[PDB]
Amino acid sequence: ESQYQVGPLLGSGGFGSVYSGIRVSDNLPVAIKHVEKDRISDWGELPNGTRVPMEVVLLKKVSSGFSGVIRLLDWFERPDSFVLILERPEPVQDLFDFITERGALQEELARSFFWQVLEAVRHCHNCGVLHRDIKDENILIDLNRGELKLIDFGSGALLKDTVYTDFDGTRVYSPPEWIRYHRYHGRSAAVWSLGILLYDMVCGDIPFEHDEEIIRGQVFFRQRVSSECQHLIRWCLALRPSDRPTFEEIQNHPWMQDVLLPQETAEIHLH
Ligand SMILES: N[C@H]1CC[C@H](Nc2cncc(-c3ccc4oc(C(=O)O)cc4c3)n2)CC1
Numbered sequence: 518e519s520q521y522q523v524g525p526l527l528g529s530g531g532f533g534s535v536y537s538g539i540r541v542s543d544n545l546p547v548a549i550k551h552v553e554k555d556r557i558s559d560w561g562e563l564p565n566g567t568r569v570p571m572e573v574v575l576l577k578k579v580s581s582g583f584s585g586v587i588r589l590l591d592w593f594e595r596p597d598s599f600v601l602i603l604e605r606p607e608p609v610q611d612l613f614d615f616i617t618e619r620g621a622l623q624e625e626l627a628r629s630f631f632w633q634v635l636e637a638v639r640h641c642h643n644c645g646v647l648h649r650d651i652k653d654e655n656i657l658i659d660l661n662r663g664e665l666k667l668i669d670f671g672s673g674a675l676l677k678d679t680v681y682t683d684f685d686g687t688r689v690y691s692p693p694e695w696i697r698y699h700r701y702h703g704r705s706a707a708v709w710s711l712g713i714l715l716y717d718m719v720c721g722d723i724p725f726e727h728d729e730e731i732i733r734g735q736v737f738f739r740q741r742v743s744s745e746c747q748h749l750i751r752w753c754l755a756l757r758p759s760d761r762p763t764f765e766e767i768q769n770h771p772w773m774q775d776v777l778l779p780q781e782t783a784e785i786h787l788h
Contacts, residue, residue, distance in 0.1 A: 715746070
């Protein structure tokens with residue numbers, strides 16, 4: 518309020534509105550996200566009784582120096598909204614706009630980005646958080662350091678081992694068991710979404726736009742993609758949840774060997 522200087526609106530949508538800002542005390546870049554109270558479907562509570570959106574609970578759980586998930590720095594409650602103060606790398610482009618500009622990515626670049634998103638999603642699950650909205654729109658690229666950040670925990674949940682029967686993330690990344698039965702388990706649904714994301718990186722667009730295509734699960738490659746990379750994608754997009762790989766199996770797959778470091782990624786592909 519007097520703590521932050523507000524800059525341009527960055528975007529708005531299902532998630533609320535997010536602005537660029539600066540923390541006046543040390544000129545730290547921040548993003549300032551406003552979430553309307555009446556659009557908040559899940560609430561949690563802090564170890565002290567305050568009632569908060571569940572997004573603040575999940576962000577606190579994953580907050581830390583490990584840079585692959587966005588860090589919540591502070592939050593405020595107002596009469597009809599909460600305001601979240603998040604870290605802001607700079608300069609940043611989201612992965613969706615990056616793909617719009619470059620088209621399908623060279624596999625060495627897709628490998629580096631996909632690897633980083635797997636490390637971020639493992640960090641969420643280690644911290645007991647299921648994101649439920651992994652997609653290019655929710656990944657920021659720090660262009661100078663080559664580091665990706667997963668953002669927007671607004672559709673997420675606490676990770677559990679039993680079935681989920683509610684979902685409000687992005688339908689064209691959602692698995693066939695959600696489309697058909699309104700039921701999924703968190704890790705295999707996350708794996709399906711990561712297969713959609715990997716196809717999006719290497720082909721320049723998602724593979725399925727319609728319920729019918731998600732349920733049939735046949736994947737056609739519209740760009741030249743190596744057999745190893747097509748194997749990994751088809752494995753993530755296995756129709757039966759228990760036929761999908763674990764995160765360890767994804768990261769030990771032959772396609773994922775010899776990944777670039779984030780700095781080398783920036784020097785080779787982003788600079
Ligand atoms: N669709 C685009 C619109 C422009 C936007 N550009 C920029 C530039 N700097 C920081 C940010 C920025 C930084 C942190 C963030 O956290 C969230 C959240 O929901 O957790 C959203 C968000 C956005 N976004 C990226 C997303």
